[PDB]
Amino acid sequence: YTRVVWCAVGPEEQKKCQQWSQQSGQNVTCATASTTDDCIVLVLKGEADALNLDGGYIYTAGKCGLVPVLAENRKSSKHSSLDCVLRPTEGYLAVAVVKKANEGLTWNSLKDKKSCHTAVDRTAGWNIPMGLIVNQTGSCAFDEFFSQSCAPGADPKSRLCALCAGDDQGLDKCVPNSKEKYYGYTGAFRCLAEDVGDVAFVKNDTVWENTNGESTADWAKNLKREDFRLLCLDGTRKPVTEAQSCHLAVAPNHAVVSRSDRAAHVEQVLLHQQALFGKNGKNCPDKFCLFKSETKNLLFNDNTECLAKLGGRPTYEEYLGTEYVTAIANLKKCS
Amino acid sequence: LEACAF
Ligand SMILES: *[C@@H]1O[C@H](CO)[C@@H](O[C@@H]2O[C@H](CO)[C@@H](O)[C@H](O)[C@H]2NC(C)=O)[C@H](O)[C@H]1NC(C)=O
Ligand SMILES: *[C@@H]1O[C@H](CO)[C@@H](O[C@@H]2O[C@H](CO)[C@@H](O)[C@H](O)[C@H]2NC(C)=O)[C@H](O)[C@H]1NC(C)=O
Ligand SMILES: Cc1cccc(Nc2ccccc2C(=O)O)c1C
Ligand SMILES: *[C@@H]1O[C@H](CO)[C@@H](O)[C@H](O)[C@H]1NC(C)=O
Ligand SMILES: [Fe+3]
Ligand SMILES: [Zn+2]
Ligand SMILES: [Zn+2]
């Protein structure tokens, strides 16, 4: 066995990683970089072994030769006697979320509105909605579609970063890590909740998990699910209980990637680390919980029940699926 | 649909 070196994206992940490392007795140790792309480069250089990635970043990492190893599996919708680690993953619903009180807004009137995205290059926050918008408008000028946005990872002086807020001190505006107040699923949802933006591209679970007291976070603790609507592609608005019939796409779950020569060993270590620190793990919550970070989704999404084995030793294209890959490929023609 | 970005 070797140690596995995890790559943490920004300082809040680095802190959680350091706590994991200490609890694992250094079976896992930590490298940290400022962005997911830079973590992918550390992994390609062999200076880190692995990290968990949204499907859009899996595409980046997979074009560079890194491979999926285990997928996040959240609470199953339907009944299953299968253990979490063996249950097939179900994909999450990419949605566009607006305030109920913003009554005129539908999918067909998004032009010149303000948008909140998890980050450039992520599935629900970017690849799915911008791919759809490029397609529908017949124009690659997706940087001119919304009047202002927060899209972490875009040029910080551009309209795509105009709404981003940076950290406590207002430094690091638009950096694609958790120090940016509007980064990621919860940041893009907060960007809508605070009416900085008119629309947030997140996933269905984000809305549930940050409303009706499911989050105690100060910006979220008082949000009511009834105050939000989903935007459907047919131009209708639905309550957030209707995401199965009003989503933009089904996304492949976030998954751990590594170099191919390290995957088997990364997989074995992770299966053992989640037996200790995962949901009902032997030492969670007593000592450390790998899948909690007070809603901040650090290293893994907080709704993860386990990391699951993949069927078919899939390549990254197999894992993402041919349609998603082609959608990304098409959108990347614009850049 | 081609090479590694890095
Ligand atoms: C949208 O996401 C929410 C949050 O994950 C899902 O609601 C959860 O569903 C699980 C599985 O049934 C329940 O056991 C949880 O208690 C629910 N959480 C909350 C906070 O209510 C919901 O099913 C998803 N909707 C769709 C269409 O997939
Ligand atoms: C945007 O449109 C492109 C161009 O049509 C879509 O790409 C096609 O997707 C279908 C369905 O998977 C494939 O069978 C075609 O072969 C693809 N066409 C081309 C020219 O590559 C893409 O899926 C759309 N983007 C979305 C829906 O986000
Ligand atoms: C065609 C199809 C349909 C549903 C899922 C996929 N691919 C996946 C493969 C692994 C993990 C997740 C997915 C998914 O899209 O949820 C494909 C290729
Ligand atoms: C660390 O890994 C070693 C080797 O597999 C193992 O004996 C030990 O149980 C692990 N400990 C923790 C705390 O993860
Ligand atoms: Fe995602
Ligand atoms: Zn669908
Ligand atoms: Zn295969």
Descriptive key words:
heterodimer; A: 335 residues; alpha+beta; D-Maltodextrin-Binding Protein, domain 2; four-stranded antiparallel β-sheet; 19% strand; globular; B: 0% helix; elongated; binds a molecule of 2 linked components (NAG-NAG); binds 2-acetamido-2-deoxy-beta-D-glucopyranose; binds fe (iii) ion; Lactotransferrin (chain B); metal binding protein; C-lobe of Lactoferrin; Iron binding protein; Hydrolase
Please, could you describe this protein's structure?
The complex is a heterodimer of chains A (335) and B (6). Chain A is of the alpha+beta class and 335 residues long. Chain A has 2 domains: 2-73 and 255-316, Periplasmic binding protein-like II (D-Maltodextrin-Binding Protein, domain 2, 3-Layer(aba) Sandwich); 74-254 and 317-327, Periplasmic binding protein-like II (D-Maltodextrin-Binding Protein, domain 2, 3-Layer(aba) Sandwich), CATH 3.40.190.10. In chain A, 28% of the residues lie in helices and 19% in strands. Chain A has 9 helices and 13 strands. Chain A has helices spanning 10-23, 36-45, 55-63, 123-137, 184-193, 204-209, 263-277, 316-320, 322-332, and strands spanning 4-9, 28-33, 50-53, 66-74, 92-99, 114-117, 148-150, 199-203, 228-231, 237-238, 249-251, 255-259, 304-309. In chain A, strand 9 (228-231) and strand 10 (237-238) form a beta hairpin. In chain A, helix 4 (123-137) packs across helix 9 (322-332). Chain A is globular and about 60 Å long. Chain B is mostly loops and 6 residues long. Chain B is elongated. The A-B interface holds A 37, 40-41, 44, 60, 63-65, 329, 332 and B 1-6. The site of a molecule of 2 linked components (NAG-NAG) has 7 residues of chain A, from helix 4 and helix 9. It is classed as metal binding protein. The entry lists the keywords C-lobe of Lactoferrin, Iron binding protein. It forms a dimeric assembly. The entry is titled "Crystal Structure of C-lobe of Bovine lactoferrin Complexed with Mefenamic acid at 1.90 A Resolution". Chain A: Lactotransferrin.
